[PDB]
Design an enzyme around this catalytic site. Structure first.
Site: not given
Ligand SMILES: [Zn+2]
Ligand SMILES: [Zn+2]
Lengths: 361, 361
Positions: A95, A274
């Site tokens: 390679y 509330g």
């Protein structure tokens, strides 16, 4: 100008193409190993710049670069050529030797025909569109882990030298305009990382598990940051989301979103029309309240005092309210629609060592 | 049991009292320099534990500890005594010598009457209820800086040895139950810090300016964390909140909330009833979308593809949707009320080096 990309169907190819087409005006000609010889000549002859990303009949000259240079031989203009070689050119294995033969070929060709050439010796790469279960061990690990599929790691001490595809693409774009990054007299991609396979596997597993413990990556560490983004790219298209843990009751809900050991965490509080929550103080735990929908009040009262301080706030005007230590505080929904408050806190919640004490008002 | 706190009106006093009354069942008797001699005897005689925090007629014995021990002389039970001395006992200056005389007095008294004693040599302290423009340079700096009042620093290299009031209180609570922290054979408060005046001033100024650049303290650094909380306590009661920078237009708004260099940042996106935002992709920028009100869709489409993936989501079920790199994405309000999406991003937004590219669908 005209840019031809050989190996355009490859990892770096798809990335370079995507960027260049969106970030530039240049005409991009893609060339892959299934591009009839007819157009190969076409694009090459039209070329103003060649980004050679392509790879390297048991007998006979089968060099693709050789062929490409051969065709460019008939190009009026002297288009610059970018050659992606490997740091393997040093080593002596098929390679490496091959990649070395490619540089040599290109320098010789350059000295004769005058084309300016940019030869880089890239290390292993990693990034989003790399294919798994192929050559890239990182792509393979990301793909598998994100699917709870087991992985195989022979040696965690194996060191890897890498470049993130983002750098690769940024460097190529710089060469394309004659301002390559030079180091040691040669063109070279910046931000090379040296990492252990073990560090990679840990990071990857941490990324997956971070989904559950609402954790985040250490973003000021370049490698981790780059790795995190590439990991996300290998996510199944049906797994982009995850459910958060909502603590529900009559008053509404409280959900953790993001947790960190060094910059606090942020949760989402939802309060019904509330209700009132809070009425407690802390010694050093402190928060940042930001209401993004609804309207109400955030009340304070110093522990050693009687005066009540009120902060009326709502989703119309986005404003943060710090919760200073030593003041009991509470928050109340004054509207008729649910109130949602984003809450940032300087530390993780621990019911054993809580730092919260009940005290009305 | 019965706990008397001498110097209960002091910095450590108010803190210890606040904690003990909320965190425990013990009966707390506060003693300050304006507590008639009548009750002083009262509380002292009733005492089961004495936390002596009080301080040290140009002629004559005016030692307050001497007086206190004298009265305790008539206490049936042998209540343990905690004495807050100083690391100054070492140095040879009036203050140190005085504190040394106090330890000596207490050890002698202990050897005769048998009371178990816990003598600590505390360094300078810092924390919330300390008074400014008095003795504490940190309280003074916090109070002034939080009011844009100028400060005076003679030498930034002056080193300071400190203990955070939280540790002081935690250690006292540990002694109160006979498990003091021993080091070098003596009781000693943990987490002592050694910091420069300059480092303190920098940190403080950074804390104030962090309000504007939506910055956060480095919370995994104990000193900084403790300092940040105490700074918040010196905030004017009318300055607990600050306005965020809303980017407004026809589609709605985008507001930055919290920014960090290592764990990303989170912003708030608000979208009107029918608009769509996004339609772009990133190379490595990635996000986490969380809709906390309204309902709509988050759409994805890989750059090299045609398939559109949809994620229908809303404020009823809290779920995070990761935005993987390489996919264009957009989000749309499908409801009739504004859609608010909390957005976490892995990096700061930079219009020069944006990492976002337009691409429909
Ligand atoms: Zn709180
Ligand atoms: Zn985005």
């Amino acid at each position: 100008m005209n840019i031809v990309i050989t190996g355009a169907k490859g990892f770096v190819g798809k990335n370079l193409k995507a960027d260049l087409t969106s970030t530039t005006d240049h005409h991009i000609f893609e060339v892959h190993r299934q591009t009839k010889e007819e157009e190969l000549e076409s694009a090459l002859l039209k070329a103003d710049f060649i980004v050679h990303l392509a790879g390297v009949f048991s007998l006979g000259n089968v060099s693709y670069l050789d062929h490409v240079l051969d065709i460019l031989t008939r190009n009026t203009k002297k288009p610059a050529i970018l050659l992606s070689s490997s740091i393997q050119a040093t080593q002596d294995n098929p390679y490496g030797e091959s990649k070395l033969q490619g540089e040599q070929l290109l320098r010789e060709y350059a000295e004769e025909y005058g084309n300016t050439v940019y030869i880089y010796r890239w290390p292993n790469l990693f990034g989003k569109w790399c294919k798994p279960n192929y050559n890239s061990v990182i792509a393979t690990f990301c793909y598998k882990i994100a699917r709870n599929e087991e992985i195989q790691v022979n040696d965690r001490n194996v060191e890897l030298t890498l470049n993130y595809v983002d750098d690769i693409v940024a460097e190529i774009k710089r060469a394309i305009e004659g301002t390559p990054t030079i180091e040691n007299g040669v063109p070279t991609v910046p931000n090379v990382f040296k990492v252990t396979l073990g560090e990679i596997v840990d990071l990857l597993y941490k990324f997956k598990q971070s989904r559950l413990d609402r954790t985040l990556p250490k973003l000021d560490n370049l490698f981790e940051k780059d790795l995190y983004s590439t990991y996300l790219s290998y996510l199944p298209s049906t797994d982009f989301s995850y459910p958060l843990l909502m603590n529900v009751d009559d008053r509404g809900s409280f959900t953790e979103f993001i947790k960190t050991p060094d910059r606090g965490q942020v949760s989402v509080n939802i309060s019904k029309p509330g209700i009132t929550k809070g009425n407690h103080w802390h010694h050093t735990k402190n928060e940042k309240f930001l209401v993004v929908s609804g309207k109400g009040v955030i009340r304070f009262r110093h522990v050693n005092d009687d005066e009540i301080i009120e902060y009326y706030v709502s989703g119309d005007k986005l404003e943060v309210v710090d919760i200073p230590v030593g003041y009991t505080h509470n928050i109340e929904n004054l509207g008729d629609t649910d109130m949602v408050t984003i809450m940032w806190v300087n530390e993780m919640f621990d019911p054993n060592q809580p730092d919260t004490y009940f005290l009305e008002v």
